[PDB]
Amino acid sequence: GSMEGILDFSNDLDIALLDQVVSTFYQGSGVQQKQAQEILTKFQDNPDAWQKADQILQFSTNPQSKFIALSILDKLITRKWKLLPNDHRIGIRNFVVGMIISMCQDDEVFKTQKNLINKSDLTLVQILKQEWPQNWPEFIPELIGSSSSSVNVCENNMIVLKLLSEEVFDFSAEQMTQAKALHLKNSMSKEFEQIFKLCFQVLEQGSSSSLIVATLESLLRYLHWIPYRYIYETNILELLSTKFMTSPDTRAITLKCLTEVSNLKIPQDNDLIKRQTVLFFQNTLQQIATSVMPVTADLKATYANANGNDQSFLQDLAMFLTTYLARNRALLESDESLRELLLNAHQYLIQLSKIEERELFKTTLDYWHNLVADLFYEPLKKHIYEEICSQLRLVIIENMVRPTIQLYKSEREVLVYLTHLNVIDTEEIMISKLARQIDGSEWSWHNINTLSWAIGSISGTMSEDTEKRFVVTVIKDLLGLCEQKRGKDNKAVVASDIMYVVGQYPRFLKAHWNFLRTVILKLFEFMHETHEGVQDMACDTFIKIVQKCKYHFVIQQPRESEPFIQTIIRDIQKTTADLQPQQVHTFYKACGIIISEERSVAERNRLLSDLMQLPNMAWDTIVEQSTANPTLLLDSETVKIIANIIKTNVAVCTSMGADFYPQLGHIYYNMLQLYRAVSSMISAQVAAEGLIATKTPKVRGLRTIKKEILKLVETYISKARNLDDVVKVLVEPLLNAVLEDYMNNVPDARDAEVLNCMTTVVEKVGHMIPQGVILILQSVFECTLDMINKDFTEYPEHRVEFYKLLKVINEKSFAAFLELPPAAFKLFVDAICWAFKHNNRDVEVNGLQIALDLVKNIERMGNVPFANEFHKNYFFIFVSETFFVLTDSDHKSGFSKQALLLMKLISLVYDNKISVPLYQEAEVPQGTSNQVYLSQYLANMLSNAFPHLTSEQIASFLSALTKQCKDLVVFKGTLRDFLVQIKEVGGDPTDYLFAE
């Protein structure tokens, strides 16, 4: 279109045209906006646009155009400043400084173009980072001087200094080299005495609110690093905690400053310092009570109303109080005259903790945890806080969340502490709360759920006798509450809360068998209830109680004729008749927990056989039927039956582990034959219908059978104790059933769960089956690698499981890679490096660990032909491939492990652990050390990959890096320094002497 004219640099820049593009972008819409956007990005990215920046800044009337001009200048200053002729550098500085002065002198511009002035201030700071103080020693003196001639200039100078402090102390770690950061930190520290004087004078004298606020904003940044004497040996704390807490325009920033003061490095000896720390807290709290709101105010209501900046203020007040009191409350706990202050501050926190705001509640709760833990352990403290703690009990009980998971655990911990501190008070609050559920004054589904969670959360805190009375009272009252209510909906809610509380008090259940049996039988009744959620609740409570009370199901209880587990198995068909499949499996898993408590082998195996009677009979039947007619496996009903049988076995094996072997032996051979039959059917369907067959319900049901078979074998082998049987009985039939099927299926039909199953086998018994591991590699390695080496996205599960398998083979049976033919071992190396390049952490991490373990495996072989050829063939491949991901800015998540691998590789040469020349006889003179050749290779590699670096930069980087290859922390710092320098031109090569 027409707007593209600004991209033609042969002609002069038409500013009026620039603004039509800029206005169209910022104020336009639709297609026009999108076009101007692409034009502006192209204009901005022109490496010569900076030359046209002073034109835009001088003659444009559009603030956005001048902003973009400064962004263009920013790119130049931060990346290519040092390549410029010195004249341009002086010129650029001059017309940035001059522009800032002019904008500050025009009051209309100063107040209406804040964004543009702030951008100019940051651009100035970028120049200071390049030039100051070595080429600009008068900046700070001249800044302080200019401040006196104009309130506007003085206010803006506070903005510049704020940004300078941020760039030097807050955001330098990853953006500057260590040496440059230290240089600028020292320079600011050298001249801060003058800076502080100006800042204090402004605060003590100034009357312009905007100037005061800017000065306080800069002070907030200083408090991150300045020595404490500037705060405690001046009168600044008085000003902050009194004057500036009264006016709302300075209140927010002042409170943030005082929060950071509460974190300064302060001597713990001086009693006058402690007095000053007490004093500014006293002053702040007094100003809050007189100028903002009294202690009694309803902060919950104020926050909910959301007037003005009330929400941010209450957030900041919570941060101030919690920060100060976590560090300094002991200062207030001994002196009688400070007791009211201590308790008023905690009362504000009580009121803040009633606010309905999740993230703010977590902030106050973190503090309460700190307090009640100290009251639990510290002598002679808990009595000070009795009234605070009593209120807190109610707050936490009334805001209990659903057992969100982290928040519940935090709430439980505080409430447990609070219960120990006063068990009587806790119990009375909870019983009262329950009364107000029964009398209806506070009744609701939410309120009864919350109270039940709180009651259940303190299990274990009371004596068993007190707990007995308490549990009986709560359950009686809850039982009456359920009878009282009408409608399934209300009764279901209460009945579920009853079961929740019961399941939280296993000590009670263990001591009262007759009650425990009644509970279980009631849960079995609820398993026939169709009301939404009841059956899930009944099964979840059942397995939860079993996990804790299993012993009382496996013994024969007094007055009973058999262990209750027998009774459960006798009626299992009736009990579960109405459950969905997932719920039946939970039931069987719970039975397996109990059965594994029986350590009589013959009794345990008998219980196991009886539990599995129904699935085993269903299994025997459709092993006969399925065999006589493989068509059945196309019947969705038979497929679903089979999958649920296997899922039942998985559930029981999950809880019984090693004890499951007799049941596995009952089905194992017929199960693997089924795996083959299913496999043939899947292949036949894909052949008859195409790859789309894998999406059909029929094939998905068939593949579920295969996946559950693999999961069952996985589950048992991962828990097996007799590994001789795993090797002699299980592995060979397994590999024969799964490996060829995987290799010879088309990619879209290969189950990634095969790889996962093989990983478990290798992990558990890999050391005992070296020929089996070779067979695994032969069947899955090349064909899986070909699935995943064309892009980083296809076959995501195979990708992850593939490198998990290679990793465990490399750990447990490294000899299998030694048997690979040279061509396949080369693919192995390619596969490892390919993993480096993934952004997917589930692949990149394993790729780097395999590489590290492989180098270690090679090193362990000593001076032998395979190790020597490995270094000759692959050492520099790994060095260069690791360097590539380290420096390409697209794998920052792997930096730590990339650095470790690189340091290991370099240390091999540094320690002469490689016995052959890494070079060829013709490359370098005879006798050249691998050390020298490594440095030459790396120097040449970096020169071609980063041609804008000087030879001196590269040599100094490599000298430091190799010297530091036994010091990972320092090694990583030098790598980070290199990553900074490659982003710019003219980096200082002495930076790499920082550690030395």
Partner: peptide, 17 residues
């Protein structure tokens, strides 16, 4: 006996009017 009273009551727990 207080546990036995409560247990008897628990045995009649029900969710339908």
């Amino acid at each position: 006996s207080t546990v036995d009273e409560m247990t008897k009551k628990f045995g009649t727990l029900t969710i339908h009017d």
